[PDB]
Amino acid sequence: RFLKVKNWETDVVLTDTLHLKSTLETGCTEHICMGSIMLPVRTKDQLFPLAKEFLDQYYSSIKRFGSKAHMDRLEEVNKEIESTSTYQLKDTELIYGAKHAWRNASRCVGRIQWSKLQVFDARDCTTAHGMFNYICNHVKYATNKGNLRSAITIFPQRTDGKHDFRVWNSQLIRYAGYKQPDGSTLGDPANVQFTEICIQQGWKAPRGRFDVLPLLLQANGNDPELFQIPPELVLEVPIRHPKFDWFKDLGLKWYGLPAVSNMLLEIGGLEFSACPFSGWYMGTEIGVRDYCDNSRYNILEEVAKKMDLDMRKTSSLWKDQALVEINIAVLYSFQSDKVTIVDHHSATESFIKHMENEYRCRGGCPADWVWIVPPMSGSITPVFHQEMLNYRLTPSFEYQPDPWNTHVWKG
Amino acid sequence: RFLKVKNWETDVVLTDTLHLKSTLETGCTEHICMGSIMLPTKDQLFPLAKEFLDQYYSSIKRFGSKAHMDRLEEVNKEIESTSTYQLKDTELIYGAKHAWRNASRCVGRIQWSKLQVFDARDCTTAHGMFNYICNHVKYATNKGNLRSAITIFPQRTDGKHDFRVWNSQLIRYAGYKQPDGSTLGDPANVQFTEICIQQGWKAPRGRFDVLPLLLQANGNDPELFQIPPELVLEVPIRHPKFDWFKDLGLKWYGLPAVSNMLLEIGGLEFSACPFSGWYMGTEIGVRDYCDNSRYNILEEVAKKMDLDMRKTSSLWKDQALVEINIAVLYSFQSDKVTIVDHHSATESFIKHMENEYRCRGGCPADWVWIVPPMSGSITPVFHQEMLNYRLTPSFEYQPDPWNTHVW
Ligand code: HEM
Ligand code: HEM
Ligand SMILES: Cc1ccnc(CCCCCO[C@H]2CNC[C@H]2Cc2cc(C)cc(N)n2)c1
Ligand SMILES: Cc1ccnc(CCCCCO[C@H]2CNC[C@H]2Cc2cc(C)cc(N)n2)c1
Ligand SMILES: C[C@H](O)[C@H](O)[C@H]1CNc2nc(N)[nH]c(=O)c2N1
Ligand SMILES: C[C@H](O)[C@H](O)[C@H]1CNc2nc(N)[nH]c(=O)c2N1
Ligand SMILES: [Zn+2]
Q1: Cβ(B366) – ligand 4 distance below 6 Å
Q2: Of A360, A380, A268, which Cα lies nearest the Cα of B375?
Q3: How far apart, in whole angstroms, are the C-alpha atoms of residue B109 and residue B101?
Q4: B85 and B21, same structural domain?
Q5: What is the DSSP letter of A215?
Q6: What is the domain range of residue A321?
Q7: Phi, psi (deg, nearest 5) at residue B308
Q8: What are phi and psi of B184, to 5 degrees?
């Protein structure tokens, strides 16, 4: 089978054969597409196949397919699984695995960078204090005083599902949200429930608009523990605008390091339930979503108010006007402070080049159009006009349930 | 099989039962989503007809009635005897409204029940087709107060006698490839413009030349007609604050009227069914004007605004895009030609989708097409999970006739 994808701007046509390596399911059927749905304890049985399939990929990538080293490693993993019911990855396999989970992440527009990933093997970690130390080193290494470097830290894999390592924060660095008695929210409304859990666990909340949350860390299935990231390790950027002097007085800032901490990394059948990873921002993640979603900081009105836009009718495009200015301000601020950031024009152009290169050398690039297209200015970016095929390859990053829903408290 | 969609901004959760009536296939499988792909006998005819008449009689609350049974029997006899059948006027009107109600890529469906249907099944010649079309254009334009309409020409018989409107829309501008190497006018219309010229059209060779209609009746070779110029309402584009904007020399037409689709009702195929509503501003301001392969005007507008074009991160493109779209909306509003902005349209679509979930058990919606091509996430449709599936009656895309037609 060959599937073709067209670009409607360039008329470039690509042929995908890689989708033939897909096994996981999409959510879609013959009768129903679920492409815009956000969300569409293993035994030995399922395991050796997953292991073998991963190891065959690994050994092909390094041009050693079928070699003695390849065969002995299959043999070795086979026997490890029968004797212990699981197995351990070699460092080189873990690194290759983590790189490929990113390469395979179909909602990631930043994948041109996939092969440049610093992998911190934290599989020797046993306690939450150990996790905290690991995460500080990650944050410091990745921050690099503004010159951001992609990185991932990988904690011990799942065993019986009763001893999971988990980072309870959704990202390593986020701002607290506090729901007020009058129904308004102070700070980030996306973090209210998590902030409540931190408070209940003993965090002394400053109750401001940009309070960096404490890490809440679960090791070996134990109850999680609170730690404050050292403030000197949290790089932040005050947001100002190049032409509008009043913009700074909105009191806005953001942190420099985007670091997803709630996902599951699957490599060769093994499950790494705590695998925080970080890169750098595309400007719209902050300027469009973080600042301008109604359920987030929601600053559009106040900005358009300061700009004296005609707010009487939507068709003055006052929201679109304020939206561009805010996004200009975020890119300007990060740039002036020398904190790595990419704009959505540059990021999407790089992605199309990456995607074409992947079609040529790999036979495809799974891509989720719903997520890859930026949330402003969609059609003046080259990805809008690009047909994409979304399917699931392993190694992979997966969503997992928030741990407060599933954790059995020990006391 | 019983599905939930969530809006992530409002936490509103809707249950879809309507997908169970899904009929056609999507392009997707359990292994590959094709959500972003643009194009993903008497035996079969009776099931198709019954399925339709059942939903018709159910809609008028006479399901299982004597009138229902009698009609089903009537239609059955007609197929076995004549190999096809004819829709009653009421069935045609119902079917056309429902094909619009079912159009998963249409954001304007809150309007679906207010559709004027023109029954042109009595038409026999291209000249007749032209007369019907002018009347459609004039009815729908309504001196700027636009009214939704569809004109339905005779159904396909043996496939050798198709009615087709060769144009993709009733009103579009010509495109000409130049000795220069650049394109004059609308680059999307170069091939069709050459067919017009090949067929006799004397092209003015300008940037905004309304194309002639190329009409095919009873599967004959198509013929050329000019829409009377006084029936084509156009809007000159100016900006409310930039004096220089009008000097770009831009205009657009008021009536968007898609004329290349196939309407399928109860298994019958209406290969010529041009239909029209009114524009959402972004369709012109973002796509017609700013697409690289369309009028591609971003650079020239950016220049007159004196923006910093040295680096993409000044967001000059985004700035210019907003002003072009302000100018479109302003111009149409000033000349009193119906238009809707993308905020207002997507808000109405969210209201429409809620009515539909409550009253019909779902609403098929293609998120990739529903979300406007600028400012995605400040419109409510961005945060709204949607299920896409194919219900009949339906509008379908069909092969350009020049690739099909034996001359
Ligand atoms: C080099 C800098 C990177 C940039 C500019 C970038 C860009 C982005 C953006 C804009 C998104 C969508 C996020 C959203 O809308 O919430 C995303 C998603 C994602 N990226 Fe990246 N990315 C980068 C690096 C990384 C790294 C290092 C990884 C892991 C190794 C990664 C894996 C993912 C995954 C798994 C998603 C989907 C997340 C989800 O489902 O919530 N990306 N990327
Ligand atoms: C009343 C005002 C209407 C508005 C504001 C509107 C809005 C839109 C928009 C913005 C699109 C996307 C088109 C594109 O991006 O190229 C679209 C597509 C479409 N609409 Fe509507 N619509 C209207 C009326 C109608 C009517 C009257 C019909 C049929 C009776 C219809 C059926 C369709 C179909 C079948 C599509 C998809 C066309 C394709 O696949 O190329 N719409 N609509
Ligand atoms: C490494 C990197 C580089 C550049 N940017 C980033 C930022 C990613 C931040 C992710 C925040 O996304 C949050 C907010 N909305 C959906 C949610 C993530 C999510 C939610 C759900 C239900 C499913 C899913 N797959 N992913 C990370
Ligand atoms: C009735 C109405 C109301 C408001 N707006 C409109 C404008 C729709 C104009 C149609 C323009 O669409 C053209 C340009 N890009 C895709 C193409 C239509 C199309 C192309 C293809 C390959 C498949 C498909 N289903 N539809 C029509
Ligand atoms: C409902 C819909 O799938 C949801 O709003 C999606 C759309 N596209 C997105 N794209 C990105 N990058 N991030 C998101 O959170 C979303 N949200
Ligand atoms: C490849 C992708 O499907 C294509 O560019 C789509 C995206 N969304 C669209 N949405 C609308 N309304 N109209 C279009 O023409 C397109 N083009
Ligand atoms: Zn799909």
Answers
A1: no
A2: A380
A3: 6
A4: yes
A5: E
A6: 236-258+281-346
A7: -80, 105
A8: -100, 135
* B153 and B45 belong to one structural domain: yes
Which residues from B are below 8 Å from A346, CB to CB? 312-313
A77 in the same domain as A61: yes
Q: Which of B286, B339, B394, B397 to mutate to test the pocket of ligand 4 (most atoms within 8 A of CB)?
A: B397
**Burial group, residue B273, by CB count within 10 angstroms (0-12, 13-18, 19+):** buried
The candidate with the shortest Cα–Cα distance to A254, out of A355, A155, A331, is A331
- Residues B242 and B335 placed together within one structural domain of the fold: yes
Beta-strand runs (E) in B89-178 = 116-119, 149-152, 164-165, 175-177
Residue B348: exposure state from Cβ atoms within 10 A (0-12, 13-18, ≥19)? middle
Catalytic residue among B71, B101, B109, B172: B109
What total number of domains does chain A contain?
3
Experiment type: X-ray
For residue A411, is it within any domain? no
Distance A366 CA to ligand 3 centre (A): 18
Is B378 among the domain residues?
A: no
Look at ligand 4, atom 14, and give the residue with the nearest C-alpha.
Answer: B188
Cis (ω within 30 of 0) for the bond into B40? no
Per DSSP, A289 falls in state I
Q: Which of A293, A317, A385 sits opposite B322 (nearest CB)?
A: A317
User: In sequence order, which residues have a C-beta less than 8 Å from that of residue A411 and are 6 or more positions away?
Assistant: A223
Final residue of a domain: which of A346, A362, A389?
A346
Question: Is B374's CB within 8 Å of A320's CB?
Answer: yes
CA distance A176 to A198: 9
Q: CA gyration radius for chain A?
A: 23
- Please report whether residue A246 resides in a domain: yes
Same domain, A268 and A290: no
> Resolution in A for the shown PDB structure?
2.1
Determine, yes or no, domain membership for B11.
Answer: no
- Taking the C-alpha atoms of residue A362 and residue A20, their distance in angstroms, rounded to an integer, is 12
Look at the block and give the residue holding tokens 């719209």: A284
Examine the domain organization and report whether B56 and B167 are in the same domain. Answer: no
CATH number at residue A339: 3.90.1230.10
A78 token code pair: 């086979």
Residues A70 and A191 in one domain: no
Total H helices, total E strands in chain B: 12, 18
- Rounded to 5 degrees, what are φ and ψ at B394? -150, 150
- Using CA atoms, how far residue A30 sits from A172, A350, B264, B390, in Å, is 39, 33, 20, 10
The three-state secondary structure class of B123 is coil
The structure tokens listed for A77 are 């993993």
Nearest by Cα to A284 from B114, B91, B375: B375
Is A155 in the same domain as A24? yes
Using an 8 Å Cβ cutoff, are A228 and A214 in contact? yes
